[PDB]
Symmetry: C2
């Protein structure tokens, strides 16, 4: 089978409060639309809602509330000028989780 990393075998059992915080992040990524939006935001380093909706092939109204909720959770920053709202990822934890997910997909391709 597989075995926990040798240097991580000395950490005390994660507490419930510790688990809930990381679970918030896992919940955020456990959704294909959020994953795709976060991936698009990560490649570009930030897009307005019109360009973002375009990249993931959806109507802006289909993704606008989801982005706002991500900003509510302090995972994105929403910069409004006029009616243009530009989003970018400000939580590096969410980014590292996404990167590991991308690694697993490449490896699934056997590459």
């Amino acid at each position: 089978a597989c075995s926990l990393k040798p240097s991580l075998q000395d950490r005390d059992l994660i507490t419930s409060a510790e688990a809930g915080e990381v679970v918030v992040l896992f919940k955020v990524l456990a959704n294909d639309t959020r994953l795709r939006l976060l991936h698009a935001l990560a490649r570009s380093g930030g897009l307005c809602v019109t360009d973002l909706a375009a990249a993931v092939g959806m109507k802006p109204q289909a993704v606008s509330n989801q982005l706002q909720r991500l900003a509510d959770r302090r995972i994105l920053r929403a910069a409004r000028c006029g009616n243009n709202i530009h989003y970018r990822i400000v939580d590096p934890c969410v980014l590292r989780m996404l990167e590991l997910g991308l690694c697993l997909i490449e490896e699934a391709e056997q590459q």
Copy 2:
């Protein structure tokens, strides 16, 4: 900062097809109790329901049901001899994602003075 790692900036936008398999990984991990159970299993390299339920704050019967479900989803291997069932994590994707979670909890603690 928050920039994507340069080696990963070339892959095309993840499709809904590729997103499906990784989303299932996050759904399994996106639960307080399951994550603590998975860590307790990862620390020890495998436990029975009685030791594992003692390790976390839970009753053996609830823990038992949780473990057979993870086994049903092929996250664990349930090794039975007699009436003793020993559970081990056999999904390495689950394992790396748990380990990343553990590193983030540690870095967060460090970064706030302890």
